Amino acid sequence: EIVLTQSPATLSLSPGERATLSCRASQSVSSYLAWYQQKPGQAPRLLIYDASNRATGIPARFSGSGSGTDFTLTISSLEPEDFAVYYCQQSSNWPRTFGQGTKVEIKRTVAAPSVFIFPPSDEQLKSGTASVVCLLNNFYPREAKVQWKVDNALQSGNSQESVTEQDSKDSTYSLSSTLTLSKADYEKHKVYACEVTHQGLSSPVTKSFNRG
Amino acid sequence: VQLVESGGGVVQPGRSLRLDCKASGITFSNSGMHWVRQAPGKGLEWVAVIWYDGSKRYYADSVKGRFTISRDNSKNTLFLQMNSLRAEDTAVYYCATNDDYWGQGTLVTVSSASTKGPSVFPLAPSSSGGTAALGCLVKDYFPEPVTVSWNSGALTSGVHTFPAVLQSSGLYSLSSVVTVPSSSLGTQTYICNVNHKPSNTKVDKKVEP
Amino acid sequence: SPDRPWNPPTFSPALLVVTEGDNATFTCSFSNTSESFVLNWYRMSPQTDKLAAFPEDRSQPGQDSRFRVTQLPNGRDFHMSVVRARRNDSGTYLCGAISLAPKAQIKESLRAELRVTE
């Protein structure tokens, strides 16, 4: 299998700006590279095949280049429609291999998040389990770190994050990290703290509470 | 001018299943066909290909010996036989011609988990910046999806419903949160609305600080 | 060859000589029942230049025209015609067939030459 690496991971632009996306092969596919477009909850859309040739009924602003190993898809004047995830593909040999894809993200002003911490539902305990939720609403960019700290102590291997898709109007994300602990171990500690770090934060802020 | 797929949904491990892709308003019989899946939240992965007549076919290493790709050119139907399915094979399977006509995609979920209704737990609010945040936590249900409304769709501003994440139990869990003004807590009652249609479950939770 | 062998169109004559200001015509006979193909007319240079095509392209402005493509009644042969031929209209001409799939694949005939006297 050939390994297609796409760069960058995310691209933050605005309507009208240039867009250049790169794809690197573990090997040489010659010109057999293709480029696809995908929006959330949809099927892949062909854009450029054979690295130059543009798909039919595809806007002129879309183009491509590169040969052999490295190739570049380009969007001259970016459009609000064009914000999506872009994968390349090689038809050289088998198996046909895609890339991880590059995400073209809407670029906005930098807004720091809002940190909220929710103690385990009283009733959720009646079951024998506890879940702590650290909510982060309305921020940008997407980069965020959340360290769970119980009683000054370390912790990890527990939590799972989730982040909503980019807001339509606002253009910001939202993240919610959950911490699920046995009802027992939950009760044998004191403070539950959520430490968050964001490029909009002048200094990492930590929300917490006590079992009582 | 389409490709319509079929034969998806939930199946236990090791149990087989078979996809059907019926093309229309094209010439299927003379085009070549492909199979491409994608794991949820992850990129696309090529699966298999069959030449238009069937003279040759190639697979992905991940599917060898298990999957089988074929076509009946008479009925203009592409077939995919998926045998010995593993939980990892969970994906959305699209069919596409070599000339790149793609379908809607068909969803196949592989899990040993039974169909279970969600537990719904309240998330107590505030202590924020002038606004209060109150969520509801929908846990240990299967399979997806679950519709959530707040006060029967009568409150949408500040509503955020996070994508459900699959957890070590093999059961999904998510959190739906809404942002409201602090001072309003108690003049305006907040009730969460949970629906899981397959499990046939509807729950309304009254969230109070 | 996953898709399927699709054999290219043809052109005629190999060398066409018309007086200048006069009308020259080439005949492209292409037949496919299956799918949807669009015929294109070309002339090269020191390098494809698209002159006409069928169905007639209305997309770009520029009103009248010299180069035009039309299907004959038998529904196999097509008429490739430059009218009011200049002296610099001479050069390597050709035709090609094009599919309608997004990944559309093109095949061209064997190029022919035109000469304009006077």
XYZ file of C-alpha atoms in Angstrom:
539
model
C 0.000 0.000 0.000
C 1.116 3.543 -0.818
C 1.019 6.114 1.986
C -0.465 9.473 1.016
C 0.252 12.197 3.558
C -1.852 15.342 3.355
C -0.733 18.717 4.673
C -1.852 20.648 6.603
C -4.296 19.023 9.046
C -6.559 22.079 9.078
C -6.665 25.253 6.954
C -8.193 28.476 8.314
C -9.236 30.880 5.552
C -11.992 33.256 4.488
C -14.062 33.598 1.319
C -11.839 34.804 -1.514
C -8.489 33.688 -0.099
C -6.139 31.313 -1.915
C -6.126 27.654 -0.844
C -3.151 25.342 -1.419
C -3.238 21.749 -0.164
C -0.321 19.309 -0.436
C -0.162 15.535 -0.764
C 3.010 13.459 -0.428
C 3.462 9.857 -1.523
C 5.560 7.119 0.117
C 6.355 6.269 -3.501
C 5.634 7.594 -7.012
C 2.131 7.416 -8.536
C 3.189 9.621 -11.519
C 0.095 11.675 -12.474
C -2.461 9.076 -11.215
C -3.446 11.224 -8.197
C -7.059 12.439 -7.751
C -8.617 14.979 -5.358
C -12.031 14.709 -3.682
C -14.261 17.098 -1.700
C -16.396 16.013 1.261
C -18.834 17.992 3.410
C -20.195 16.515 6.656
C -22.954 13.949 6.155
C -22.318 13.588 2.424
C -20.585 11.501 -0.241
C -17.110 12.341 -1.613
C -17.045 14.769 -4.540
C -14.463 14.470 -7.291
C -12.653 17.707 -8.104
C -9.415 17.052 -9.990
C -8.369 13.770 -11.649
C -4.920 12.979 -13.145
C -3.566 16.012 -11.186
C -4.457 18.510 -13.926
C -7.694 17.449 -15.576
C -10.675 19.005 -13.860
C -13.867 17.038 -13.327
C -16.912 18.017 -15.389
C -19.296 20.664 -14.080
C -16.586 21.661 -11.621
C -15.897 25.407 -11.059
C -12.874 26.962 -12.798
C -11.431 28.258 -9.522
C -10.569 24.658 -8.670
C -7.247 23.376 -9.961
C -4.322 21.070 -9.295
C -0.624 20.528 -9.941
C 2.381 18.431 -9.006
C 3.597 15.149 -10.442
C 5.394 11.997 -9.368
C 5.602 12.194 -5.590
C 4.178 15.628 -4.524
C 0.942 17.278 -5.759
C -1.063 20.433 -4.911
C -4.840 21.078 -5.161
C -5.597 24.832 -5.410
C -8.675 27.029 -4.898
C -8.078 30.563 -6.242
C -10.968 32.564 -4.783
C -12.296 30.556 -1.886
C -16.053 30.358 -1.437
C -18.259 29.588 1.620
C -19.423 26.483 -0.238
C -15.821 25.244 -0.471
C -15.416 24.739 3.283
C -15.130 20.998 3.667
C -12.671 18.127 4.044
C -10.369 17.242 1.129
C -8.853 13.778 0.493
C -6.509 12.796 -2.337
C -6.426 9.415 -4.084
C -3.991 7.424 -6.216
C -5.113 5.264 -9.152
C -1.500 4.138 -9.848
C -1.803 0.603 -8.506
C -3.628 -1.495 -5.919
C -4.935 -1.057 -3.381
C -6.153 2.443 -4.291
C -5.180 4.538 -1.263
C -6.644 7.797 0.042
C -5.117 10.278 2.465
C -6.217 11.200 5.987
C -7.626 14.336 4.399
C -7.172 18.048 4.987
C -9.953 20.090 6.583
C -10.617 23.567 5.251
C -11.812 25.537 8.246
C -13.457 28.937 8.452
C -10.984 31.485 9.837
C -12.345 33.900 12.432
C -11.158 36.134 15.276
C -9.645 34.460 18.339
C -12.178 33.907 21.119
C -11.375 32.162 24.414
C -13.736 29.554 25.874
C -16.189 29.483 28.760
C -15.503 26.780 31.308
C -18.294 24.942 33.102
C -18.106 21.950 35.404
C -21.016 19.607 36.196
C -20.909 17.271 39.230
C -22.289 13.727 38.778
C -26.085 13.551 38.608
C -27.430 12.717 42.065
C -29.615 10.117 40.395
C -26.734 8.768 38.283
C -25.271 7.704 41.609
C -28.479 5.789 42.476
C -27.271 3.557 39.635
C -23.746 3.097 40.930
C -21.817 5.346 38.520
C -20.548 8.967 38.365
C -19.961 11.296 35.402
C -18.288 14.710 35.578
C -18.704 16.994 32.555
C -16.420 19.921 31.732
C -18.156 22.102 29.124
C -16.403 24.597 26.871
C -18.699 26.888 24.859
C -17.986 29.263 21.964
C -14.241 29.516 21.242
C -11.595 29.543 18.475
C -9.377 27.981 17.320
C -10.219 24.333 17.941
C -6.985 23.574 19.805
C -7.790 22.871 23.447
C -6.299 20.744 26.242
C -8.210 19.520 29.269
C -6.394 17.963 32.222
C -8.521 16.283 34.887
C -7.107 16.826 38.378
C -8.658 15.062 41.382
C -7.364 16.282 44.795
C -4.255 17.895 43.314
C -3.545 14.382 41.949
C -2.879 13.448 38.353
C -5.373 11.653 36.187
C -5.952 10.354 32.643
C -6.976 7.219 30.728
C -10.501 8.002 31.864
C -12.001 10.870 29.888
C -13.292 11.192 26.347
C -13.790 14.499 24.559
C -16.362 15.599 22.004
C -16.448 18.731 19.841
C -19.431 20.029 17.875
C -19.015 21.059 14.258
C -18.161 24.702 13.568
C -20.957 27.139 14.323
C -22.773 28.511 11.281
C -22.931 32.195 12.209
C -20.452 32.461 15.099
C -17.767 30.217 13.502
C -16.679 28.839 16.909
C -16.458 25.321 18.344
C -17.692 23.733 21.564
C -16.035 20.890 23.486
C -17.385 18.675 26.283
C -15.038 16.331 28.177
C -16.672 13.699 30.375
C -15.103 11.926 33.341
C -16.777 8.659 34.331
C -15.740 7.066 37.613
C -17.137 4.214 39.695
C -19.577 5.492 42.318
C -17.177 4.153 44.932
C -13.864 5.774 43.929
C -15.768 8.972 43.248
C -16.866 9.169 46.878
C -13.392 8.498 48.329
C -11.936 11.817 47.006
C -12.602 15.566 47.682
C -12.150 18.119 44.845
C -12.814 17.669 41.110
C -10.996 20.156 38.906
C -10.932 20.788 35.154
C -7.775 22.459 33.814
C -8.130 23.926 30.321
C -5.608 25.521 27.932
C -6.488 27.541 24.883
C -4.673 29.918 22.534
C -7.234 32.503 23.645
C -6.459 31.963 27.330
C -4.017 34.434 28.937
C -3.401 31.711 31.501
C -4.916 28.246 31.863
C -8.129 28.386 33.877
C -9.396 25.632 36.159
C -12.983 25.004 37.244
C -13.663 22.841 40.297
C -15.897 21.921 43.232
C -16.094 19.725 46.322
C -18.180 16.562 46.816
C -20.172 18.253 49.563
C -28.575 8.924 -13.139
C -27.931 7.405 -9.696
C -26.555 4.561 -7.591
C -28.844 3.326 -4.798
C -27.449 1.117 -2.080
C -29.089 -1.257 0.363
C -28.580 -4.008 2.917
C -27.079 -2.029 5.797
C -27.594 -1.602 9.541
C -26.552 -3.515 12.684
C -25.088 -7.043 12.821
C -23.337 -9.040 15.581
C -19.687 -10.128 15.150
C -18.874 -13.074 12.878
C -22.365 -12.906 11.455
C -22.429 -12.091 7.764
C -24.268 -9.430 5.762
C -24.546 -8.482 2.083
C -24.727 -5.062 0.425
C -26.606 -4.366 -2.798
C -25.935 -1.406 -5.072
C -28.354 -0.789 -7.936
C -27.283 1.848 -10.468
C -29.733 3.747 -12.687
C -29.889 6.209 -15.597
C -26.294 5.473 -16.637
C -24.730 2.526 -18.360
C -23.770 0.281 -15.396
C -22.940 -2.721 -17.435
C -20.077 -1.000 -19.229
C -18.666 1.061 -16.308
C -16.324 -0.411 -13.705
C -17.371 -0.460 -10.041
C -15.795 0.343 -6.682
C -16.499 -0.025 -2.963
C -15.358 2.608 -0.479
C -16.111 2.642 3.236
C -15.422 5.162 5.973
C -15.276 4.628 9.740
C -17.315 7.232 11.613
C -15.313 10.411 12.236
C -12.371 9.063 10.227
C -11.238 9.365 6.608
C -12.124 7.251 3.581
C -10.630 3.830 2.950
C -10.766 1.973 -0.373
C -12.319 -1.480 -0.090
C -12.740 -3.394 -3.361
C -13.062 -3.149 -7.151
C -14.541 -5.285 -9.933
C -13.884 -4.889 -13.659
C -17.018 -4.263 -15.700
C -17.324 -7.792 -17.134
C -15.861 -9.479 -14.053
C -12.663 -10.616 -15.760
C -10.736 -9.353 -12.735
C -11.243 -8.028 -9.224
C -8.999 -6.617 -6.481
C -9.610 -6.217 -2.746
C -8.199 -4.401 0.252
C -5.890 -6.469 2.456
C -8.194 -5.709 5.369
C -11.081 -7.458 3.588
C -9.313 -10.418 1.847
C -10.885 -13.881 2.222
C -13.813 -12.312 4.041
C -15.504 -9.840 1.718
C -16.516 -10.738 -1.829
C -17.229 -8.277 -4.647
C -19.255 -9.180 -7.735
C -21.808 -7.825 -10.192
C -24.885 -9.002 -12.018
C -24.904 -6.884 -15.183
C -28.326 -8.150 -16.152
C -30.094 -6.582 -13.169
C -27.589 -3.692 -13.158
C -26.752 -4.482 -9.564
C -23.402 -4.371 -7.832
C -23.082 -6.867 -4.983
C -20.892 -6.913 -1.889
C -20.749 -10.013 0.285
C -19.319 -9.157 3.697
C -18.532 -12.236 5.787
C -16.880 -12.638 9.173
C -17.625 -9.051 10.121
C -15.585 -7.525 12.917
C -16.472 -4.498 15.052
C -13.713 -2.650 13.192
C -15.625 -3.091 9.918
C -18.135 -0.501 11.127
C -18.230 2.075 8.330
C -20.387 3.717 5.636
C -20.083 1.819 2.351
C -20.441 3.834 -0.875
C -20.452 2.348 -4.371
C -18.800 4.342 -7.153
C -18.128 3.799 -10.859
C -14.530 4.239 -12.051
C -15.740 7.408 -13.796
C -16.589 8.615 -10.263
C -20.379 8.503 -9.875
C -21.011 8.011 -6.113
C -24.120 7.034 -4.138
C -25.609 8.181 -0.827
C -23.648 5.624 1.192
C -25.082 2.785 3.275
C -24.470 2.459 7.004
C -23.238 -0.802 8.531
C -22.702 -0.993 12.298
C -20.974 -4.055 13.771
C -21.506 -4.546 17.515
C -22.345 -7.278 20.016
C -24.318 -4.761 22.075
C -28.083 -5.206 22.456
C -30.555 -2.430 21.651
C -30.913 -0.481 24.896
C -32.726 2.670 25.928
C -30.803 5.700 27.210
C -30.626 6.784 30.824
C -31.121 10.536 31.036
C -29.416 12.474 33.801
C -29.678 16.204 34.601
C -26.603 18.437 34.617
C -27.024 21.000 37.438
C -26.190 24.559 36.467
C -23.819 27.461 37.021
C -21.303 28.717 39.524
C -20.108 31.640 33.635
C -20.036 35.267 32.601
C -23.670 36.338 33.110
C -25.165 33.274 31.458
C -25.994 29.926 33.037
C -25.170 26.611 31.394
C -27.382 23.587 32.038
C -26.980 20.277 30.234
C -28.518 16.834 30.041
C -26.585 13.663 29.911
C -27.886 10.793 27.825
C -26.005 7.602 28.679
C -25.647 3.902 27.851
C -27.936 3.469 24.867
C -27.690 1.703 21.522
C -27.780 2.065 18.718
C -27.552 5.637 17.437
C -29.083 8.093 16.686
C -31.069 9.879 19.405
C -33.023 13.049 18.815
C -32.875 15.676 21.538
C -35.060 18.753 21.868
C -35.247 21.396 24.594
C -38.742 22.307 25.751
C -40.131 20.706 22.580
C -38.042 22.733 20.129
C -39.244 25.933 21.782
C -35.732 26.769 22.941
C -32.996 26.763 20.268
C -30.723 29.682 21.203
C -27.598 28.471 22.966
C -28.459 24.833 22.301
C -25.466 22.555 21.784
C -25.869 18.823 21.248
C -22.512 17.068 21.231
C -21.840 14.081 18.962
C -22.363 10.846 20.896
C -19.159 8.942 21.585
C -18.915 5.157 21.806
C -17.436 4.040 25.129
C -15.710 0.955 26.512
C -19.082 -0.689 27.277
C -20.006 -0.798 23.590
C -22.788 1.693 24.368
C -23.003 5.271 23.082
C -23.287 8.282 25.369
C -23.765 12.016 24.732
C -24.478 15.331 26.418
C -26.852 18.054 25.304
C -26.308 21.480 26.863
C -28.126 24.808 26.578
C -26.967 28.292 27.611
C -29.497 30.629 29.250
C -29.398 33.852 31.316
C -28.663 33.271 35.029
C -31.454 35.443 36.465
C -33.952 33.504 34.353
C -33.389 30.314 36.329
C -36.785 29.615 37.876
C -38.955 32.072 35.885
C -38.508 29.789 32.904
C -38.649 26.038 33.477
C -36.178 23.930 31.514
C -37.141 20.485 30.328
C -34.959 18.153 28.261
C -36.549 15.934 25.629
C -34.923 12.624 24.785
C -36.072 10.292 22.016
C -34.590 6.947 21.138
C -36.752 5.576 18.315
C -35.319 2.028 17.857
C -35.537 1.335 21.602
C -38.834 3.229 21.506
C -37.958 5.551 24.315
C -39.073 9.088 24.978
C -38.027 10.882 28.145
C -38.477 14.421 29.435
C -36.102 15.575 32.183
C -36.779 18.689 34.251
C -33.458 20.396 34.879
C -33.195 22.579 37.934
C -30.288 24.027 39.914
C -9.168 -1.454 -18.422
C -11.823 -1.619 -15.734
C -14.264 0.634 -17.569
C -14.552 -0.770 -21.105
C -12.869 -0.328 -24.496
C -14.443 2.573 -26.347
C -13.069 3.088 -29.815
C -12.322 6.637 -31.038
C -14.030 8.670 -33.800
C -12.590 9.438 -37.237
C -11.903 12.411 -39.504
C -11.848 13.161 -43.244
C -10.244 14.125 -45.411
C -6.559 13.905 -44.411
C -5.716 16.991 -46.431
C -8.468 19.439 -47.307
C -7.672 22.356 -49.595
C -10.125 25.227 -49.985
C -9.639 28.654 -51.523
C -9.548 31.542 -49.037
C -12.780 33.265 -48.016
C -14.407 29.984 -49.024
C -16.027 27.315 -46.852
C -14.204 24.162 -45.743
C -15.835 21.079 -44.242
C -14.638 17.939 -42.455
C -16.753 14.871 -41.679
C -16.507 13.111 -38.304
C -18.439 9.862 -38.118
C -18.833 8.736 -34.522
C -21.381 6.296 -33.147
C -22.149 5.313 -29.571
C -25.629 4.334 -28.367
C -24.513 3.840 -24.798
C -23.986 6.743 -22.398
C -23.683 10.419 -23.311
C -20.891 11.763 -25.425
C -20.178 15.262 -26.638
C -18.211 15.893 -29.819
C -15.464 18.495 -29.953
C -13.641 20.264 -32.760
C -9.986 21.204 -32.462
C -7.065 22.928 -34.116
C -3.535 22.888 -32.757
C -0.565 25.257 -32.511
C 3.062 25.174 -31.231
C -1.768 22.492 -27.594
C -5.530 22.049 -27.961
C -7.780 24.982 -29.024
C -11.544 24.222 -28.830
C -13.378 25.717 -31.814
C -16.826 24.210 -32.007
C -18.701 21.297 -30.405
C -22.004 19.435 -30.390
C -24.396 19.994 -28.630
C -23.533 23.591 -29.624
C -21.960 25.380 -26.658
C -23.813 28.532 -25.732
C -21.969 29.059 -22.440
C -19.454 31.693 -23.575
C -20.401 35.064 -25.183
C -19.300 36.071 -28.678
C -22.501 35.811 -30.544
C -21.726 34.589 -34.172
C -19.117 32.127 -35.269
C -17.228 30.549 -38.143
C -16.611 27.057 -36.744
C -19.742 24.893 -36.288
C -20.568 21.204 -35.603
C -23.783 19.509 -36.731
C -25.064 15.943 -36.770
C -26.253 14.543 -40.095
C -29.656 12.777 -40.454
C -28.208 9.245 -40.376
C -27.141 10.049 -36.831
C -23.639 8.693 -37.184
C -21.689 11.218 -39.344
C -21.105 14.816 -38.147
C -20.194 17.978 -40.081
C -17.154 19.977 -38.966
C -17.129 23.255 -40.890
C -15.095 26.456 -40.987
C -16.799 29.149 -43.043
C -15.160 32.189 -44.668
C -11.747 30.548 -44.251
C -8.799 32.904 -43.733
C -5.185 32.196 -44.684
C -4.192 31.559 -41.066
C -6.959 29.014 -40.587
C -4.513 26.472 -42.038
C -3.122 23.997 -39.573
C -3.576 20.651 -37.925
C -7.251 19.996 -37.195
C -8.937 17.073 -35.452
C -12.007 15.886 -33.545
C -12.617 14.066 -30.295
C -15.334 12.344 -28.298
C -15.944 13.190 -24.639
C -18.030 11.449 -21.969
C -20.261 13.133 -19.374
C -19.054 11.429 -16.198
C -17.173 13.750 -13.788
C -13.961 11.761 -14.344
C -14.772 12.127 -18.058
C -12.508 10.393 -20.503
C -11.627 11.757 -23.944
C -10.566 10.133 -27.207
C -9.505 11.980 -30.352
C -9.343 11.072 -34.038
C -6.377 11.124 -36.407
C -5.507 14.738 -37.166
C -6.061 16.146 -40.632
C -4.700 19.221 -42.385
C -6.473 22.126 -44.070
C -5.008 24.415 -46.735
C -6.269 27.786 -47.831
C -5.127 29.007 -51.223
C -5.357 32.379 -53.039
